[PDB]
Amino acid sequence: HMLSDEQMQIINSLVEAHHKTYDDSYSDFVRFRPPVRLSMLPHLADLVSYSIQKVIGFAKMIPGFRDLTAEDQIALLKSSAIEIIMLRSNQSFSLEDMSWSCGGPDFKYCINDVTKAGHTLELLEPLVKFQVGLKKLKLHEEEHVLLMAICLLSPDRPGVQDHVRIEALQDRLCDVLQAYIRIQHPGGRLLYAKMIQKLADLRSLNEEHSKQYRSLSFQPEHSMQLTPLVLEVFGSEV
Amino acid sequence: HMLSDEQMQIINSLVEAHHKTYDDSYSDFVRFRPPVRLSMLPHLADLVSYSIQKVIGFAKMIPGFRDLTAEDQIALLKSSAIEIIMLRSNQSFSLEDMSWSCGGPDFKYCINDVTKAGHTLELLEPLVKFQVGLKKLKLHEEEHVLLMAICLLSPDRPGVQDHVRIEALQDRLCDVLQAYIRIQHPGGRLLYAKMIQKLADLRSLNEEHSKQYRSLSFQPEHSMQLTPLVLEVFGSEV
């Protein structure tokens, strides 16, 4: 019926962490290789690279992530990177346009623009469908941030070693979320469940992304357009 | 006293090759990460990467380069890349500004701009000094192109295997140059020699570059700003 002092300080450091790693003006977007309408690939690879940096910045501020071994910090960031990106992107996604609108007509990413980056419209439909659903949940900033931290700390991942310590951290976070909705969110009686279902949805979006990325990464003429960080984070190296 | 039909067709395919890989309008420069005044590093790494692509395109059209093994084609491109870049850059270098002027006030690279890309003004002075000298030679397009092809086909290089076949190719090119100056260049009686001296000069500029690049390449926060192609071409891998 009331969130504890420690559940509150977890919400605090997490929203502050998101505030320091997410710019609603999208100012830095001008430093990327320009969008061209695979003409969109250099801009979108620059965008994904910049976002991996922010996901890293955010992750480092999740209570307990820092305590983990360098190895587990990497295993989790590698596997969840694309999922955190897709979640955080919702903050820019509009239902009125069915696009990710980032402060400008040049940083407005519609389905057709993502197609000119190697990808197939058939594999783009589950992403926009996932983005419509997420937006329809009309999440509070605390819930959104909590969903990214729970997603990042997921145990079911290739390379993770301390599957007991991160399951512990994810549960302490799931606990903060479940209590937050009940206390602070009216009409949210079935929200916790609706959100956990989005984590599973993301796992499927992740597979489909990994397959599409594999296609690009093997063609050196496309791989060369990527950044060292994207190559490293999405690469198979152990 | 007269260039042979075969010395002429070597000049032809070489100037045509340079025409297809060098854009005097510098239009593609807008597709790079923007210049910022190490703020210049993303733009300059994008510039060097784009130029490696053009040097590759050019190399492929040098008569006899294509016949070489894939390995030697690589050994030569890796070692000479920076030198071909420095030579080809002269076409944009101005004596009136002491800068590389590329169709725009944003693509005007002065000494101070190159400093904000990791490099030290002390190691920049031999480059501009090399650029003043090269420009003072007032080379014909045929001589300039011939100098890049001779530079690329240099035998004294790490990794080269067929040191007899490329020395042969470089000499057949040196022959075309020496005859061209005598027949087609008035007051060039000491030009061939002045130019060969620039190849040696470049070798010193290359060492100094390799040392400076090593400094950047080891710091992952700087290396991440580079491109896959720059990393590959300037990397130690064999």
Binding site: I56, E232 | P220, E221, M224
Partner: peptide, 10 residues
Amino acid sequence: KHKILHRLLQ
């Protein structure tokens, strides 16, 4: 292996 990730995580 993962030189950038390591630097960024420190």
